[PDB]
């Protein structure tokens, strides 16, 4: 088992949870903002083309 290895495992696990949570938040934000940009560009270009 080892106290030392269990402690190491615990540190790696807890920080992995933190890193993952922040990673997912950033991933979701990038996805959200890039989606918004595609939508705005698509709307605007369709407006330009409809306006001649």
């Amino acid at each position: 088992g080892s106290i030392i290895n269990e402690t190491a495992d615990d540190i790696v696990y807890r920080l992995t949870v933190i890193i993952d949570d922040r990673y997912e938040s950033l991933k979701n934000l990038i996805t959200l903002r890039a989606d918004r940009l595609e939508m705005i560009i698509n709307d605007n270009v369709s407006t330009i083309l409809a306006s001649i």
Copy 2:
């Protein structure tokens, strides 16, 4: 409440503070640059729509 467990807590706490700091900076950067791009896109589309 061992010296080993207090030490583990300290390591996790200290690196969480740093991770959070960088996360918040990246979040703010993404948000500011995306807002800025939306503004530039709409300003430019307005200029094109005004030129017929």
Copy 3:
């Protein structure tokens, strides 16, 4: 090395792998979304120019 040095190396190694993986995924996502926006914009400008 000593038990404690090896344990510290193991903790740093294991979290570096985690950090590097999340980093790579974020880098790939940003590159993908920005690449796609450039592709969309390039196509749209060609379409606008061809419509006069």
Copy 4:
């Protein structure tokens, strides 16, 4: 001895370097891709206006 304190400090120090390096790479990439998109958009609007 003080080796457990020192080793914890060493772990925090080493991972701080890793975290900060990945943070800086992402910061720089987002900033670069944003700047590129802004340049493209500005060039394209000029090209379009120069046509009608």
